[PDB]
Amino acid sequence: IKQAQSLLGIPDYSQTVVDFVKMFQKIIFPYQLVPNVIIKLNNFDQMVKIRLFCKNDSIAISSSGIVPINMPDFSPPNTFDYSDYANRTNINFVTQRVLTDGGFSSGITVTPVKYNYYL
Amino acid sequence: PQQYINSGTEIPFCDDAEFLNRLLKHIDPYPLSRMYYNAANTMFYTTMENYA
Amino acid sequence: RVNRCIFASIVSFDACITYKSPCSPDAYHDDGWFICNNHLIKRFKMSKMVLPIFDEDDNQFKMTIARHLVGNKERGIKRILIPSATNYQDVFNLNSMMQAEQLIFHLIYNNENAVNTICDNLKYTEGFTSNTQRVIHSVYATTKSILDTTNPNTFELRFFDVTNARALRGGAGDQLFNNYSGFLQNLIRRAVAPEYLQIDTEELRFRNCATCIIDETGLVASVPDGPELYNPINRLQIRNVLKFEGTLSGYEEYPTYVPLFLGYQIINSENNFLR
Amino acid sequence: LVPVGMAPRQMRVNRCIFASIVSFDACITYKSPCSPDAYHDDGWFICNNHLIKRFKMSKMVLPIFDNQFKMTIARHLVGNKERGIKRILIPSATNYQDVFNLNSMMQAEQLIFHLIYNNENAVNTICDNLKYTEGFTSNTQRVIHSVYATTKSILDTTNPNTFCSRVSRDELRFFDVTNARALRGGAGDQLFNNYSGFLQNLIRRAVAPEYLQIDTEELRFRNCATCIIDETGLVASVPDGPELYNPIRSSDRELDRTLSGYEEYPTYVPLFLGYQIINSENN
Amino acid sequence: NKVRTVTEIVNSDEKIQKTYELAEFDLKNLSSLESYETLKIKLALSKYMAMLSTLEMTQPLLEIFRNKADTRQIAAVVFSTLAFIHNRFHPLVTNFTNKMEFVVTETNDTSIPGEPILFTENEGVLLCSVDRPSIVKMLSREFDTEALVNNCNVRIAKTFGASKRKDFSITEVEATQYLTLLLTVEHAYLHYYIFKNYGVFEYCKSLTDHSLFTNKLRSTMSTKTSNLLLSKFKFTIEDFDKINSN
Amino acid sequence: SLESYETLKIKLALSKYMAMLSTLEMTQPLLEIFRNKADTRQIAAVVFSTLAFIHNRFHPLVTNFTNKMEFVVTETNDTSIPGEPILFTENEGVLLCSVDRPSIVKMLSREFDTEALVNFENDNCNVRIAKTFGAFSITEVEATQYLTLLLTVEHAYLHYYIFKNYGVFEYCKSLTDHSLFTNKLRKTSNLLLSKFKFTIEDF
Amino acid sequence: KADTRQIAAVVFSTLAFIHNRFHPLVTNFTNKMEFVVTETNDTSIPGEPILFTENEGVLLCSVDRPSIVKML
Ligand SMILES: [Zn+2]
């Protein structure tokens, strides 16, 4: 949290951790995304997954994304077929294109995007 | 030339003798014989590859 | 090779302290200055310069002049160049400088009480009688000799507050100039150029308006009115590496300086006196 | 780069505060004299050289015991004939400005003193004057910030532990004349409280107690007090009468024929004052 | 080999003769020299690492050389190494005078085998050519951190005489990387020295045959300058004679 | 010993040239001055002062010297003559001094074999050990550069003296053939060119 | 090693004894001498465990304590 505040230029004595975290509640629901700060805090506690929703909400925001309420954190494995792009040929093609276009030689990594219950 | 420096300049030598001592300690258990062998053979094999 | 580098006659009487004295060579120049360029810059924010007057064939009148080292934002103490005896102790952070330098300043301003206080304090140094008193004697004698040399009363018609149009009345800058020590007065004469120079009923104007100000606080790099004049100024690193190898360049540059221009110099029937 | 990302390295650290003294005039090079003792990770946060120079005090060890515990202790460098202000071994916050000649020493050391002694007004005055003095921005500002940061780091290391010791139950110390039937002792504890946390730590490291009760055993190192504390601070004065003779044999034939190799009692005057109590060893 | 000493009193003829085998002192001397040379080389390597740190580049060396985009850091590292070697030969030199150009080749048809770092003037100033792919390949080749390298009598004597003692990202692998880079830049520096002090034709001839290095360098190096890093050991190609016959 | 005294005299002459340089009071070393083409006035002043110094040495009894001279710093190859970086032409009564700044810069920039060569010297390890038990500067390279420039201007000044004493015709003929001053000293003694010899052999 | 004073006194007394023997008629002897007990190899000379240098008027006596210990 201190590193995040310093990066944002927030004086530590000025900002309290609770308020710092609450800052992203404006993002939680409207963008239907879990703030990275909350994700990292949950990971720290785990070393010592996330899920939430709103009143009357039909779906739950989770670290994995959108999930139907009361459903498991992951949809059935065969829900989506990624073979079209989730394949070595496509991955290598995209990575090589990126390397060429950016004139790079290292530090480049492309990953197929998987999808939970919803796209 | 992709890039260049101007004339003169100055080699940026380190100054922290304590830092130098720490590095020396960190490298003491490394056998110079093994490091030399590895480096020489690395260069030799890369040259071999280039030639071939 | 007489070293007139006042403020280089400073000896770190403290054993643990070593005084580099890294000051300008020109002290060995038998000029009207009694303080060479680096001391001048450090302790008065002035840079030595020369202003030629007649330079045609062999008439080479080259009046000396120093330059402001004060920007257009400094004010009050920050802007005062040569403080008066009433405020020099405040303008200068005497406590932040070596006691020998403090003694030099006190002698220059005739602060004999401060001189006595400093020597009394030095009385209680560990090697006081051994070498502290010797250092005191050396520094004091050198400073006193310089001051006597500067003072003309020892063994001409330059007026500094007489230029100021729009002033209510009074002048008195010349009054304070008189109140100054011989060394300070000679420094002012040497560094400040009268805006006007009259020779045997022949007036030359060098500026359309004086640049310096003199008042009770002392000499100030202020303007007679309006805002202040604009006065701007290896360890190989990663950033020091330059990228690939690859607008009035053809014209000379007028200095963005603020030379000390203030006063009127009157010269009697004497001709182009070049001795 | 070589080192792991961040990964604070571990090395020795000079501990005496005065080691940070440097000439604000970058064009003037200066080296402060530091005794090598400064590099010992001990309770002392002042080196022998600075201690003797400024406080007139010299470090010393007192063996204590089966297991030989070594208790830190300082000793007088004050001569017998010194009087008045000379007797102030450690000036109080109300007198240090006078006892220490701020004018005669460097601005950095003056700041160090105004930090040790909790003089925020003087610290601020020095900071502002340096802001408006010399090429502050170029390097003088960074040098001043470095010195201030070092001093503040030392003080932040010391003060929390000092406060915990103050409120501590197991370890108790009372800087006064154990001879309550005396007048030169006074509210020594109150004066010690008046002192700063770091100054309190220094006093603890320097002045040994006249008595020491460990659990149930009490050891009496003296039948008398070798120093006192008043409003002026730590005073190298005998609470009951004539000053103790301090030969100062160093630093600032038949007799020997008989007195060949022969045990000799030192003439030093260690600091013994007050009562100390402890539970268990905590060592 | 051996020596002997005779003690005798002036007035008496009873003399005592003792014999010494110099092998012991030979072992002492050899151990001392080996330790001294090891210390010197490790000091130089640590100094090199420290100055590279002083440059304060976030990434490690291999990552730097892999990042083709950031030619700035590659040039900085190469020049710093070259200047360090130059000073190691001329300790009084702390700069390189004439400005230096740098280019980073990227293809085999642009690289020259056996000289990853080379020099060529544009008729006004010297340009250093760098084979970044080759540098990356060398520093990426897997290193052996396990096997040891090597008279049995003196070997045993040293074994029984000498003793042994049982927060930096550096492992022996990274130390090896740094040493390899230093040696490569040293080779390039020797080429450049011959160039500067004997003309471009001599430089080309040296490139063709390094043997000229012998005279062109030993005239000044072995006398006034610290010995070459490679001087620490005698190197040889396994089965050199049969390979030559091949 | 004696030869050491003559060495001391030669080094004193170099030191006098150093005093002349300090009198000129150049911020930069002559190498940088010559490298900087814009410093045309500095280059001309350096050359003129060196020539006057050499004139005073060659004619100790004569302190006079041409107090004004036309100067031209040349840069192009076609504006220079191999083996004569400095030239003294006349533009119909006007005395022009041409300077080959690129050649000067090249000579100065050439690496010198200071360390490379080993030469005999006062070397007594006993004295060194005894000393050990009893216990603004110029480098060798800078001194070499400075000597090179002084000798270059000495050659130029000799050609100039031929020009003035004999005429432009003989000056050109001297440029063609330098045999006139194989004898040299025959005044000249104060010229370093008369202190040593240099030769070239087929090989 | 901590017995630096003892080592220096031993050396000085031995030197005075040898001086008296070598000059029986002379009882005088330098009554003060600077002493330095050396330990590092670079601070010693083979074949001369004891040395007498001068630090510009100051007479220094260097001692090779490790060599003395080895011989003994
Ligand atoms: Zn210290």
Curated annotation (Swiss-Prot), chain A:
Species annotation: Autographa californica nuclear polyhedrosis virus (AcMNPV)
Source taxon at top rank: Viruses
Reported function: Plays a role in the transport of the budded virion (BV) to the host nucleus and for occlusion of viral progeny.
Location of this chain's protein in the cell: Host cytoplasm; Host nucleus
Name by which UniProt lists this protein: Protein AC109
Swiss-Prot record, chain C:
Taxonomy, superkingdom: Viruses
Alphabetical UniProt keywords: Capsid protein, Late protein, Virion
Record has Glycosyltransferase as a keyword: no
Chief place where the protein resides: virion
InterPro entries cross-referenced by the UniProt entry: Baculo_VP39
Name of one Pfam family that matches: Baculo_VP39
GO molecular function, one term: structural molecule activity
Subcellular location: Virion
GO cellular component: host cell nuclear matrix; viral capsid; virion component
Job description of the protein: Most abundant structural protein of the nucleocapsid produced during the infection cycle. The monomers are arranged in stacked rings around the nucleoprotein core.
Family: Belongs to the baculoviridae major capsid protein family.
Miscellaneous information on this protein: Expressed late in infection.
Protein name from the UniProt record: Major capsid protein
Name of the gene this protein is made from: P39
Swiss-Prot record, chain D:
GO cellular component: host cell nuclear matrix; viral capsid; virion component
Cell location: Virion
GO molecular function: structural molecule activity
Keyword tags: Capsid protein, Late protein, Virion
Further comment found in the protein's record: Expressed late in infection.
Homology family: Belongs to the baculoviridae major capsid protein family.
Stated role: Most abundant structural protein of the nucleocapsid produced during the infection cycle. The monomers are arranged in stacked rings around the nucleoprotein core.
Entry protein name: Major capsid protein
Gene of this entry: P39
UniProtKB/Swiss-Prot annotation, chain G:
Subcellular location: Virion membrane
Positions in coiled-coil regions: none
Leader peptide range in chain numbering: none
Highest taxon of source: Viruses
Subunit annotation: Interacts with host mus209/PCNA, cdc2 and cdk6. Forms a complex with proteins C42 and p78/83.
Family membership: Belongs to the baculoviridae E27 family.
Purpose: Acts as a cyclin-like protein and plays a role in the modulation of host cell cycle. May promote G2/S arrest by interacting with host mus209/PCNA, cdc2 and cdk6. The cell cycle arrest is characterized by an intact nuclear envelope, concomitant with sustained activity of host cdc2. However, viral DNA replication still occurs in the arrested cells.
Protein name, as recorded: Occlusion-derived virus envelope protein E27
Source organism of this protein record: Autographa californica nuclear polyhedrosis virus
